Design a protein around this motif. Structure first.
Motif, PDB file in Angstrom:
ATOM      1  N   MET A   1      -9.231   0.136 -14.262  1.00 31.42           N
ATOM      2  CA  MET A   1      -9.433  -0.410 -12.937  1.00 31.42           C
ATOM      3  C   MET A   1      -9.072  -1.885 -12.946  1.00 31.42           C
ATOM      4  O   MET A   1      -9.442  -2.605 -13.865  1.00 31.42           O
ATOM      5  CB  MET A   1     -10.880  -0.222 -12.507  1.00 31.42           C
ATOM      6  N   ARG A   2      -8.355  -2.323 -11.916  1.00 30.97           N
ATOM      7  CA  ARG A   2      -7.980  -3.729 -11.782  1.00 30.97           C
ATOM      8  C   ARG A   2      -9.197  -4.642 -11.658  1.00 30.97           C
ATOM      9  O   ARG A   2     -10.157  -4.326 -10.949  1.00 30.97           O
ATOM     10  CB  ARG A   2      -7.067  -3.909 -10.570  1.00 30.97           C
TER      11      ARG A   2
ATOM     12  N   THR B   1      -2.803  -9.370  -6.618  1.00 33.48           N
ATOM     13  CA  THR B   1      -1.330  -9.352  -6.697  1.00 33.48           C
ATOM     14  C   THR B   1      -0.684  -8.902  -5.378  1.00 33.48           C
ATOM     15  O   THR B   1       0.529  -9.048  -5.187  1.00 33.48           O
ATOM     16  CB  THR B   1      -0.851  -8.455  -7.843  1.00 33.48           C
TER      17      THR B   1
ATOM     18  N   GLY C   1     -16.909  -2.770  -1.534  1.00 35.80           N
ATOM     19  CA  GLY C   1     -15.903  -1.730  -1.439  1.00 35.80           C
ATOM     20  C   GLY C   1     -14.541  -2.354  -1.675  1.00 35.80           C
ATOM     21  O   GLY C   1     -14.340  -3.082  -2.657  1.00 35.80           O
ATOM     22  N   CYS C   2     -13.609  -2.115  -0.759  1.00 35.56           N
ATOM     23  CA  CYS C   2     -12.242  -2.577  -0.947  1.00 35.56           C
ATOM     24  C   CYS C   2     -11.954  -3.908  -0.260  1.00 35.56           C
ATOM     25  O   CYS C   2     -10.820  -4.389  -0.272  1.00 35.56           O
ATOM     26  CB  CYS C   2     -11.263  -1.526  -0.437  1.00 35.56           C
TER      27      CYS C   2
ATOM     28  N   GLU D   1       4.278  -1.028  -7.832  1.00 29.33           N
ATOM     29  CA  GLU D   1       3.146  -1.336  -6.960  1.00 29.33           C
ATOM     30  C   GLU D   1       3.603  -1.433  -5.511  1.00 29.33           C
ATOM     31  O   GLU D   1       4.762  -1.746  -5.226  1.00 29.33           O
ATOM     32  CB  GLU D   1       2.462  -2.646  -7.377  1.00 29.33           C
TER      33      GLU D   1
ATOM     34  N   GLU E   1      -8.490   4.878  -8.627  1.00 27.65           N
ATOM     35  CA  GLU E   1      -9.175   4.023  -9.578  1.00 27.65           C
ATOM     36  C   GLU E   1      -9.585   2.817  -8.752  1.00 27.65           C
ATOM     37  O   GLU E   1      -8.734   2.045  -8.321  1.00 27.65           O
ATOM     38  CB  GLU E   1      -8.270   3.646 -10.754  1.00 27.65           C
TER      39      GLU E   1
ATOM     40  N   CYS F   1     -10.103   1.039  -5.554  1.00 30.39           N
ATOM     41  CA  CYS F   1      -9.520   1.227  -4.230  1.00 30.39           C
ATOM     42  C   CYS F   1      -8.046   1.559  -4.286  1.00 30.39           C
ATOM     43  O   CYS F   1      -7.382   1.669  -3.257  1.00 30.39           O
ATOM     44  CB  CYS F   1      -9.721  -0.026  -3.382  1.00 30.39           C
TER      45      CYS F   1
END
Lengths: 226, 223
Positions: A1-2, A9, A113-114, B29, B109, B111
């Motif tokens: 996971m980032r 990015t 969350g996101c 990406e 994974e 979001c």
């Protein structure tokens, strides 16, 4: 996971909420938009949900996500703000408006969350009813500033102190001395930077179709100066 | 699963390849928008000049971003397997030439919708269109026929890609595809239908690495 800088990015959605009380005048601001740290850009629209703001919009700008600063390649090892993500960081300030009142602020900047979310409590005291801030005498604009960032090893974070220059309607300037400290919310490793600065530039505008009291904001920030 | 695709979703794609012993790695990406069936992505070959043409990797490099019309939403397997995701396997037979075998895991994974792939190609001709780089840098419009796979609680698919060759001749690539859910619990098993795909391959004029920019629009229709 980032994690960390990996979360920045691309374009990131932003929510900002500010719960404010200045001299007993309560207000609430919600902003939404996006940030793109690869170019150092923020694009946001804020709405005062509680009606006409009792303070000028420009006095809220510094309080209303330095994680969206562009840290160029050679500077990435100094980027505390992104290194704290996603768990986030606490941002606390004292702001002294010269010859006028004081803001005290505490915020948390983190992923929910996101979404990247900045949640703020702001308290303002001792403002003059006929001063530049309660009297709405500040121009609707913002000047460029240089924010020097230094490590705060004892708190595993950073600190900064700078002065904001607010243009006044009569040609004078309203200074606002900022004292800032940031600490990570998480426990994992963060980047504690060498001394450097954030070069900040800001344009404030309006949305001709919005009837609510509001602020449209565009900001461009880059890091430099080791 | 579908409620994860109501907005724009960030995408990460990683492909680990070996064709005739030539090993390569591609990272991509960008973002997908299933409400309009749109993909917008940029890939980098981190290992230098690719040993194979970029177009031959396109199908391998997230059908969950297909636009399924309102009346077909109960036939969207790909989205219903999310966030746990699905395994996507293919055998791709290049006519008069070699074969790709691919296995990929497509899942959330955090979001990000991630597609992680292993690709192995063998028995390619060194002077063929693939290892000889004789394919045009483009991609045609195709129909992907999807059929339910009840035994494995997933789907299967078959289609032929037409790769234009530099001399006006055409290189066919027959795809045999199987998808299986990673998680347990309910998925959507579709009636027979297809995906209609349109793709543009482009370049980033500022990018010095071997790379591919991709825009794709995909819609599902009854059969």
């Amino acid at each position: 996971m980032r994690k960390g800088e990996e979360l920045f990015t691309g374009v990131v959605p932003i929510l900002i909420e500010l719960d404010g009380d200045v001299n007993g005048h309560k207000f609430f601001v919600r902003g939404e938009g996006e940030g793109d740290a690869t170019i150092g850009k923020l694009s946001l629209k804020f709405i005062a949900t509680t009606g006409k703001l009792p303070v000028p919009w420009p006095t809220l700008v510094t309080t209303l996500v330095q994680a969206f600063s562009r840290y160029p390649d050679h500077m990435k090892r100094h980027d505390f703000f992104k290194s704290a993500m996603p768990e986030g960081y606490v941002q606390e300030r004292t702001i002294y408006f010269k010859d006028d009142g004081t803001y005290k602020t505490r915020a948390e900047v983190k992923f929910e969350g996101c979404t990247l979310v900045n949640r703020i409590e702001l308290k303002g005291i001792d403002f003059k009813e006929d001063g530049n801030i309660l009297g709405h005498k500040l121009e609707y604009n913002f000047n460029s500033h240089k924010v020097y960032i230094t490590a705060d090893k004892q708190n595993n974070g950073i600190k900064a102190n700078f002065t904001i220059r607010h243009n006044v309607e009569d040609g004078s300037v309203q200074l606002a001395d900022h004292y800032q400290q940031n600490t990570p919310i998480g426990d994992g490793p963060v980047d504690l930077p060498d001394d450097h600065y954030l070069s900040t530039q800001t344009i404030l505008s309006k949305d001709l179709n919005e009837k609510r009291d509001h602020m449209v904001l565009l900001e461009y920030v880059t890091a430099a100066g080791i």
